[PDB]
A paper describes a structure:
Host proteases, TMPRSS2 and CTSL/CTSB cleave the SARS-CoV-2 spike to play a crucial role in the two alternative pathways of viral entry and are characterized as promising pharmacological targets. The entry of SARS-CoV-2 depends on two distinctive pathways, cell surface entry and endosomal entry, where the transmembrane serine protease, TMPRSS2, and endosomal cysteine proteases cathepsin L/B (CTSL/CTSB) cleave the viral spike protein. The crystal structures of TMPRSS2 and CTSL/CTSB in complex with the potent inhibitors were determined to reveal their specific mode of interaction.
The crystal structures of TMPRSS2 in complex with nafamostat, camostat, and UK-371804, were determined to 2.6 Å, 2.4 Å and 2.6 Å, respectively. We use the structure of TMPRSS2 in complex with camostat as the representative to describe the overall structure of TMPRSS2. The ectodomain of TMPRSS2 can be traced in the electron density map except for several small loop regions (residues 109–112, 202–205, 229–230, and 250–255). The ester group in their common guanidinobenzoyl moiety then reacts with the catalytic serine of TMPRSS2 to form the acyl-enzyme intermediate and cleave off the “leaving group”. The guanidinobenzoyl group stays covalently linked to the catalytic serine and disables the protease activity. Our structures of TMPRSS2 in complex with nafamostat and camostat both capture the post-reaction state, leaving the identical remnant moiety in the catalytic site of the SP domain. Apart from the ester bond formed with γO of the catalytic serine, the guanidyl head of the guanidinobenzoyl moiety forms a salt bridge with Asp435, and is further anchored by hydrogen bonds with Ser436 and Gly464 in the S1 pocket.
Author numbering:
A (entry chain C): 256 to 495
B (entry chain A): 115 to 121, 126 to 216, 219 to 250
Amino acid sequence: IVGGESALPGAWPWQVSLHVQNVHVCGGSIITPEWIVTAAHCVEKPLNNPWHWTAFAGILRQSFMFYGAGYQVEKVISHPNYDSKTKNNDIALMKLQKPLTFNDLVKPVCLPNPGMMLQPEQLCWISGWGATEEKGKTSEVLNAAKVLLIETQRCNSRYVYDNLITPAMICAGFLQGNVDSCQGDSGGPLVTSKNNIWWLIGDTSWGSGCAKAYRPGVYGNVMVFTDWIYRQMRADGEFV
Amino acid sequence: NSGIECDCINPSNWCDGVSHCPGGEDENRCVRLYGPNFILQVYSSQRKSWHPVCQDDWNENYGRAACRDMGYKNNFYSSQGIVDDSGSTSFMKLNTSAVDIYKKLYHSDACSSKAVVSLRCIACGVNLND
Ligand SMILES: *[C@@H]1O[C@H](CO)[C@@H](O)[C@H](O)[C@H]1NC(C)=O
Ligand SMILES: *C(=O)c1ccc(NC(=N)N)cc1
Ligand SMILES: [Ca+2]
């Protein structure tokens, strides 16, 4: 996260660190004790196999993510219509071998419902262990920052992103920059508070650079993916 | 030709209790939670629209069944009656003489309780601050 601040314990209890080869790769969001919402580009080949992956929940610092604290990933499902070239439908699901135990440190975020009636510039939060500067290293501490939604029509302006924002995408941040997600934050949450409930309206997908003016963050539109998410959990629920 | 895609089925074949798509997508997304107050809604094939469920005769095992249908498995948090704020004019009332969840409801323009089901299948969205 660029321009944010370090997160407190329990501030983002759904935030999860996803690891390959003892190294943080991407973020994720807990929605059930077994299921994690992350980005499809994080699980492209060869990392589409679930045995590469380990999830760390309730731990703020990467150095504190010791061997034995992580949860092995049982299943990785990419969105069937994911396009690597356009990052369209950039969403994937991870199921854990062992369900998480929920407490004040580890809690799920609510999947968005239809009819949220969010404001066009709704105030949102992003979090993750991404770089705090463009081309920087993975951050040791979990960070978070406030961003505003940006209407897709404004975001698709020729001066911002020039018709690259699909209906499966939402923009958030500031057109002046200085506050944005970055490398390593991808797959992480874009949440908003409404009716005293935190809703997952987006998963970190892509952007041009980090915190650059007129290049805000682009996030997967979790509302569009809601039907697909429910089907996958249910399909796994009936067993396979 | 009115139709809905299975990626095309006819409207009355969407959410009618019989699977017409190869993967069953016409019968696995017929229940949903609406708005920031989690108003339980059910899709009607006849009116091609979503209608809230009346609180009348609703019990937690009905909400658990709805939670299973949504893919939440055995997760269940709460179910209570609230005033509808989804702007609906037609509702699904529970028929006692029944059968499945979506197949036990019938259309009604009012609820005796004056309340619709607010269903939360999981305790989520709560952090350190309020
Ligand atoms: C309720 O169930 C009874 C008994 O099968 C049936 O006669 C009736 O049509 C059902 N629905 C309505 C609209 O009352
Ligand atoms: C993921 O690591 C990721 C997501 C988004 C961006 N770009 C911007 N937020 N500008 C970079 C990296
Ligand atoms: Ca059908």
